[PDB]
Amino acid sequence: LLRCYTCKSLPRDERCNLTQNCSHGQTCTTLIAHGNTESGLLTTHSTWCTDSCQPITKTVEGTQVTMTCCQSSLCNVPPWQSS
Amino acid sequence: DFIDIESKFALRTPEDTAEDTCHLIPGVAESVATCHFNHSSKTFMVIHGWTVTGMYESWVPKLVAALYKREPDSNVIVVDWLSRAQEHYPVSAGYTKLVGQDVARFINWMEEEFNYPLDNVHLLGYSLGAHAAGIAGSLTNKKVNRITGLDPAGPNFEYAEAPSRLSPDDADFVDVLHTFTRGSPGRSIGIQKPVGHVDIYPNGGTFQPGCNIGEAGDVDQLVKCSHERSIHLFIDSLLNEENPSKAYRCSSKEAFEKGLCLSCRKNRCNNLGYEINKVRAKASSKMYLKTRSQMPYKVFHYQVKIHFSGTESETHTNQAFEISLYGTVAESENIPFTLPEVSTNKTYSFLIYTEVDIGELLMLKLKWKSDSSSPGFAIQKIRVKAGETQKKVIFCSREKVSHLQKGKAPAVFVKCHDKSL
Ligand SMILES: *[C@@H]1O[C@H](CO[C@@H]2O[C@@H](C)[C@@H](O)[C@@H](O)[C@@H]2O)[C@@H](O[C@@H]2O[C@H](CO)[C@@H](O[C@@H]3O[C@H](CO)[C@@H](O)[C@H](O)[C@@H]3O)[C@H](O)[C@H]2NC(C)=O)[C@H](O)[C@H]1NC(C)=O
Numbered sequence: 001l002l003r004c005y006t007c008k009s010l011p012r013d014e015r016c017n018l019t020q021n022c023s024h025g026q027t028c029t030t031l032i033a034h035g036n037t038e039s040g041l042l043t044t045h046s047t048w049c050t051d052s053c054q055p056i057t058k059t060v061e062g063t064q065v066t067m068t069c070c071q072s073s074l075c076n077v078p079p080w081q082s083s
Numbered sequence: 084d085f086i087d088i089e090s091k092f093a094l095r096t097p098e099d100t101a102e103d104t105c106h107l108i109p110g111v112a113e114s115v116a117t118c119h120f121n122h123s124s125k126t127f128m129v130i131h132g133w134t135v136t137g138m139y140e141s142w143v144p145k146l147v148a149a150l151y152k153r154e155p156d157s158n159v160i161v162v163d164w165l166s167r168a169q170e171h172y173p174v175s176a177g178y179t180k181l182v183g184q185d186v187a188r189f190i191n192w193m194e195e196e197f198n199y200p201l202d203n204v205h206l207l208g209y210s211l212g213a214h215a216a217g218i219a220g221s222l223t224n225k226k227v228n229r230i231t232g233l234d235p236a237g238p239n240f241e242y243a244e245a246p247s248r249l250s251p252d253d254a255d256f257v258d259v260l261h262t263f264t265r266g267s268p269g270r271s272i273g274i275q276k277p278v279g280h281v282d283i284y285p286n287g288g289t290f291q292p293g294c295n296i297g298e299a300g301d302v303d304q305l306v307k308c309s310h311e312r313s314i315h316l317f318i319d320s321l322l323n324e325e326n327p328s329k330a331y332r333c334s335s336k337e338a339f340e341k342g343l344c345l346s347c348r349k350n351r352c353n354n355l356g357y358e359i360n361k362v363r364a365k366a367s368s369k370m371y372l373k374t375r376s377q378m379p380y381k382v383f384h385y386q387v388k389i390h391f392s393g394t395e396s397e398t399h400t401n402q403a404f405e406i407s408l409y410g411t412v413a414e415s416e417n418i419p420f421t422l423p424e425v426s427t428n429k430t431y432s433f434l435i436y437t438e439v440d441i442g443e444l445l446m447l448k449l450k451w452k453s454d455s456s457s458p459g460f461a462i463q464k465i466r467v468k469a470g471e472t473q474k475k476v477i478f479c480s481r482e483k484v485s486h487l488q489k490g491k492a493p494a495v496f497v498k499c500h501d502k503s504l
Pocket residue numbers: 120121123124125156157
């Protein structure tokens with residue numbers, strides 16, 4: 001029994017206030033996306049419960065994507081945000 | 084030498100895969116030793132099909148060589164019935180009974196003379212060969228281990244009863260690749276009805292990609308491309324031991340083509356070829372997959388669901404779309420697909436497949452192509468189910484909606500959720 005932040009696509013300086021109870025084996029993940037849009041450049045963060053995540057940093061069509069993993073309640077927050 | 088038998092039995096080797104240099108002569112135990120048959124290893128018997136020339140086709144050395152690559156300690160016996168295979172088709176077809184009886188007599192002999200176990204024998208029959216292998220399996224003293232049917236012949240077998248063709252009873256496990264089923268039943272080159280424990284239909288079985296206009300060893304490749312493909316799929320399986328191709332059970336090929344049948348629950352999927360799981364289902368199977376035109380062959384399957392949203396209420400028809408997948412390992416850009424119609428506040432599911440090993444999905448771009456006004460929808464999320472990794476992925480727009488506008492900039496979505504099954 002672990003609780004993770006579960007927030008689809010939040011702006012950089014928004015904190016997440018939705019959480020889920022993950023199931024047998026699951027860990028906390030966070031996907032950060034930084035790149036350009038029609039309306040200016042944008043850092044977004046997405047959070048959820050996952051089975052085996054691998055962290056990555058990859059650049060994919062000009063927008064930088066980073067995935068992070070962790071195994072404690074409410075640990076999946078963007079690297080510039082606090083618990 | 085109550086052993087008159089017309090068929091010949093060559094034991095080829097990893098270093099001599101082309102010629103029939105050493106023969107196992109039934110009724111002559113000393114021949115087995117001459118030829119260095121390995122009593123401690125499994126045995127493949129390769130049974131060719133019909134041949135308008137008197138000769139082996141060029142696939143025979145390839146299959147032998149692949150089997151020895153995958154199984155370097157095994158015994159690969161090539162059965163020669165070239166003489167009977169050179170007749171007019173209905174004659175050669177009739178001779179499948181005698182070639183089968185010859186092969187069963189030979190196997191039964193190896194069992195009586197050497198206590199060689201029949202559960203160490205895998206028969207691989209191509210075309211007419213598949214039925215010769217079926218009949219042989221039905222006449223062995225104990226049941227043989229595996230029969231593999233590579234596009235079993237259709238004419239005079241489609242409406243034949245089990246004793247006279249390949250059927251599931253003929254071995255402990257029977258797996259069949261159907262690759263050239265185009266035609267009306269009984270007039271297809273390859274048999275239409277499932278005759279195995281597991282029957283796989285690459286590209287729905289009727290015709291194979293890469294077989295229309297080509298560069299084409301063999302007397303006339305262009306005509307028998309789709310038929311012969313069954314063998315090259317098996318070969319490709321022998322060479323990709325730790326990287327097989329899934330095939331997915333499905334109610335129909337039409338259903339498969341909509342992406343309704345990915346899913347690997349309760350043997351709803353299996354591996355094509357050598358690495359197959361020997362399920363022996365309660366009745367039939369019938370499984371589907373897509374493939375490439377040239378070798379490696381393996382492809383990755385995804386289902387895509389898109390809900391097209393808007394306040395305004397239009398329909399469009401035979402609309403064309405490009406979708407681009409970006410993953411941790413690679414990307415494949417500009418995959419085409421079309422939709423019968425695209426109407427507001429409706430959801431459409433569909434199959435995407437790609438030769439490219441993407442890795443885990445990260446970003447997904449959608450382009451609405453103008454047709455060979457001013458219309459567009461708002462899309463918030465796209466759902467994707469991946470067949471090979473049994474994962475459901477959700478992408479959502481970086482902003483609150485991605486506007487999809489026909490003939491303009493592609494809508495961009497990034498992964499916001501993952502799930503396994
Ligand atoms: C017949 O095939 C066997 C191998 O059979 C295969 O593996 C078995 C374990 C079973 O699962 C079979 O069903 C399967 O098909 C051949 O055995 C090979 O030969 C010898 C020992 O028999 C091994 O060679 C080496 O010898 C040197 C000494 O100079 C040592 O340094 C090595 O440690 C090793 O012992 C070889 O590993 C072995 N291979 C395997 C896979 O066990 C056998 O050669 C063959 N018979 C004939 C007549 O060719």
